[PDB]
Each structure stands twice: as structure tokens, then as C-alpha cells.
Design a protein around this ligand. Structure first.
Ligand SMILES: [Zn+2]
Length: 258
């Protein structure tokens, strides 16, 4: 039926409705730190989120998304391996049922408790919908989450999850500053990839930060209380909403640090 993360509609079944699932530049991938190529040509990342305007938080049945106003260059990403300006449109997470799994990308086979994805689209295409049809249409900033000390800047997100427990529920979520979710260092790995959920379009320039952010056990536990199902339906906990690593194929992962 509809795609998901269950036993009968999970990642291994996606190729039936979305053939590109077996494409040449699919994500996520395992980042082999000893095979990654240091590129001194790579520029530092430029993250300008001071004028960010968050609007709403939504449970879309696959994860929860915090949406931003992308009608102007309020929150943008530039520099790094990017050519042009990319506007932040939304961010969401992927997490597991246990602290030992949850991230989509892995580092030397290591899985993190969760992974944060900040999605941006290339302004030259005018349109998020137009951007996903281009090889350089999107730029996604990936950040790993490890369990340890609590992340203060994440609590506002955690506290509102009760109001969007089921699929289709949304809540006003204004005044949220995404800068509180960034690690200290902006060193990164980058490679050409795809969206990790259907339609799995190969329009993403992935920028994965080396430094993970730490969140508390209680914070992640609250993520696990969400539901894949809609209100009134049998409860299915929203956990393990991650896609496993895909073949790197003919791609090179570059590092901004040595
Ligand atoms: Zn994602």
C-alpha cells in the first residue's frame, strides 16, 4: 500500500513504486573516514539563520517537520561546496527505537541515536517543487545526535510534540531559532545524493557535519511517543523511521577537514 517503515511497506519495498530507489546517487551512505578525500578547495559553510521565521510544526506520518517562511532570503545556506543561495524550508529528524540506532548516515559503520536534516532549496529555481527536479536543487545539512547531556535549544520542540502526536496534526510554532541546534564546529563531509524518503529524487548536495550534538535520554524518549497513525486508528509508535545505507557506487565523499 502506501510507503512507510513497516515490515510490509518499508525501505526494501520502495523500489516497486519508486524505481529510482536503485539509482546511482541514492542516500544515505556510510561515510568511510579513511576513504574520504580532503579537499582544500572546499570553502567554509556560511549559515545565516538570524532572520529565520518558523511557522508551524507538523506530524506528516513519517516524521515531524518544523516549517519556515521561505518567501524571502531570511534563513539561508551558502558557501561550502555550494554555488548560489539556498533557503531553509524545513527541518525534521529520523530516530530509532533504541539509542544504538536511528541515524540514516553512518560514520565508519557507526550509527547515532538520531539524525537532524535541515532542508534548503536553490533560489535560482524559484520554487521548492522546481528545485527537486534539478541535480543541484537541494542542500541538506545533516547533524548527528548522540545521547548524553540535554540540548537546551531542542526542548521547545520536545514540549510541543504532545500536541501533534498523530498523523495530520499541526501546531503553530513561531519564534524558534534553529541556531540552537548547531554543533560548535562546522567541519563537514559532502557528497551528491538524494532525498531519503520517496520520491527519492537525486537532487541533493549533502553536507554532513562531523561533530554530533548531544541530547538527553528523556528528550529522545519523547520523540518515540509520536504515532505513525492518524487519530482514531490503532497506535503504531513512530520509531525507526530511517533508511539504511545505500551503495556509494561511482561517488567520492569529500571532507572539509584533514
Ligand atoms: Zn530526512
Amino acid at each position: 500500500h502506501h510507503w512507510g517503515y513497516g515490515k510490509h511497506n518499508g525501505p526494501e519495498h520502495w523500489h516497486k513504486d519508486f524505481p529510482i530507489a536503485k539509482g546511482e546517487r541514492q542516500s544515505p551512505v556510510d561515510i568511510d573516514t579513511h576513504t574520504a578525500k580532503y579537499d582544500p578547495s572546499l570553502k567554509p559553510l556560511s549559515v545565516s539563520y538570524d532572520q529565520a521565521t518558523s511557522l508551524r510544526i507538523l506530524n506528516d506520518g513519517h516524521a515531524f517537520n518544523v516549517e519556515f517562511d521561505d518567501s524571502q532570503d531570511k534563513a539561508v545556506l551558502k558557501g561550502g561546496p555550494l554555488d548560489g543561495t539556498y533557503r531553509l524550508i524545513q527541518f525534521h529528524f529520523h530516530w530509532g527505537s533504541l539509542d544504538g540506532q536511528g541515524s540514516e548516515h553512518t560514520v565508519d559503520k557507526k550509527k547515532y541515536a538520531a539524525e537532524l536534516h535541515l532542508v534548503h532549496w536553490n533560489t535560482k529555481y524559484g520554487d521548492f517543487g522546481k528545485a527537486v527536479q534539478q541535480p543541484d536543487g537541494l542542500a541538506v545539512l545533516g547533524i548527528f545526535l548522540k545521547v548524553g547531556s540535554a540540548k537546551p535549544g531542542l526542548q521547545k520542540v520536545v514540549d510541543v510534540l504532545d500536541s501533534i502526536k498523530t498523523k495530520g496534526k499541526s501546531a503553530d510554532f513561531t519564534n524558534f531559532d534553529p541556531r540552537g541546534l548547531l554543533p560548535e564546529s562546522l567541519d563537514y563531509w559532502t557528497y551528491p545524493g538524494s532525498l531519503t524518503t520517496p520520491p527519492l529524487l537525486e537532487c541533493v548536495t549533502w553536507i554532513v557535519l562531523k561533530e554530533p550534538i548531544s541530547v538527553s535520554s528523556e528528550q529522545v524518549l519523547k520523540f518515540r511517543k509520536l504515532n505513525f497513525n492518524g487519530e482514531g486508528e490503532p497506535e503504531e509508535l513512530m520509531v525507526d523511521n530511517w533508511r539504511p545505507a545505500q551503495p556509494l557506487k561511482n561517488r567520492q565523499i569529500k571532507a572539509s577537514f584533514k
